[PDB]
Design a protein around this ligand. Sequence first.
Ligand SMILES: [Zn+2]
Ligand SMILES: [Zn+2]
Length: 93
Amino acid sequence: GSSGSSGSPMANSGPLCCTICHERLEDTHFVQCPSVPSHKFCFPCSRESIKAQGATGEVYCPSGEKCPLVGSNVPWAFMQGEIATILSGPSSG
Ligand SMILES: [Zn+2]
Ligand SMILES: [Zn+2]
């Protein structure tokens, strides 16, 4: 299917997929809502939300629903730690 530098480096394969891309997920690594099973945002999906919402501040669900933490009555906000792990590049050169 889709093979080459231009486009997805993989073909339409896999049971689970992203919610924003709706194509495929490299691996579980993708950011999955701790409350919403359907919500499936990969690395190149959460970041955009981390900056839009608050790169240095809090970052709610990349969907814009502010889904609360499973069991807990508080929204999950990426921590400085992950914020960088997913970003993989703070500089926008
Ligand atoms: Zn995605
Ligand atoms: Zn969510």
